[PDB]
């Protein structure tokens, strides 16, 4: 008797829809990261991607508690001297509303080639309409 791996050829990725309207950013991102990593499956092995395809709608309506809408700052560096740029949660959700949840899930997910694959799996769409009618995903509440 040996402990077996998931044999990537045999793993199937299911499609789920998550409505981000009115949910807490971090508390939703933790669950999305867990689903993307595949921690809910009994065949989970750290080196195989066994997670699901998470489609998120109403990404701009994600909520943060306290004064974090006006005080949570996102920094980045351009690589040039003094090239440190800072934006707000509110301005970021106005400009690129996906990037908030994308960044939150990225920070939670592991770093590496396999983490890049799982973050590739993630699908985020603003608004109540998504171009995944063909996939026929399943509504999920979490």
């Amino acid at each position: 008797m040996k402990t077996l791996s998931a044999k990537p050829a045999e793993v199937t990725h299911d499609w789920f829809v998550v409505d981000a309207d009115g949910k807490t950013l971090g508390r939703l991102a933790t669950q999305i990261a867990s689903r993307l990593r595949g921690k809910h499956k009994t065949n989970y092995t750290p080196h195989v991607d066994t997670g699901d395809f998470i489609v998120v709608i109403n990404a701009e309506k994600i909520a943060v508690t306290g004064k974090k809408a006006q005080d949570k700052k996102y920094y980045r560096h351009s690589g040039y001297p003094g090239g440190i740029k800072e934006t707000n949660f509110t301005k970021l959700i106005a400009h690129k509303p996906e990037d908030v949840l994308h960044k939150a899930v990225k920070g939670m997910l592991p770093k590496g080639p396999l983490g890049y694959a799982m973050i590739k799996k993630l699908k985020l769409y603003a608004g109540t309409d998504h171009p995944h009618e063909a996939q026929q995903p399943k509504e999920l509440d979490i």
Partner: protein, 58 residues
Amino acid sequence: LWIARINAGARLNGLSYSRFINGMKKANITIDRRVLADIAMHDAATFGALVEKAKAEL
């Protein structure tokens, strides 16, 4: 790895790992985590029965 897989199975059956192991220990079930993970991975119904015993002991 065994603990992760057992947690996954217990949560599929409606229970967490820290309660499932406690229920095992209260039921006096001596199955090791290696065998428990094997059962969770390759036989869902037997693991469901184990979770039922644990939940009846809790």
